[PDB]
Amino acid sequence: EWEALEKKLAAXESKCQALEKKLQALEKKLEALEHG
Amino acid sequence: EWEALEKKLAAXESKCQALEKKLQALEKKLEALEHG
Amino acid sequence: EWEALEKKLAAXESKCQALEKKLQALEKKLEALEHG
Ligand SMILES: [Zn+2]
Ligand SMILES: [Zn+2]
Ligand SMILES: [Zn+2]
């Protein structure tokens, strides 16, 4: 299913970008603890 | 290689889902420190 | 665009692998705090 694969890849991209931002948010909190 | 691309995309999905759960597990530990 | 989808999937893979390593790096720092 070609069109379904295109959409799956786009969802792939969205989920990774959301995880990158969630990792940055946790890094901010961890750094506050590390330098507190 | 069409069939190889389908499988690569499925592995893609599995790895992201595993990373999302690993991020949740680290968030739990960080929150315990933040509110300790 | 078949060739563009192949490349997008490869970028997908690279970004997940980079995020896995970033999560490991944050886990190392969190563990230092947790056992400090
Ligand atoms: Zn630091
Ligand atoms: Zn908190
Ligand atoms: Zn620990």
CA A12 to chain centroid, in Å, comes to 10
In Å, the largest CA–CA distance within chain A is 52
Contact B23, C28 (CB under 8 A): no
Contact A26, B27 (CB under 8 A): yes
Q: How was this structure determined?
A: X-ray
Residues of B in contact with C34 (CB under 8 A): 29, 33
Resolution as reported, in Å? 1.4
Geometric angle at alpha carbon B22, from B19 and B25, rounded to 5°: 155
List of residues 6+ apart from A22 with CB closer than 8 A:
B23
Of C13, C19, C30, the CB nearest to B19: C19
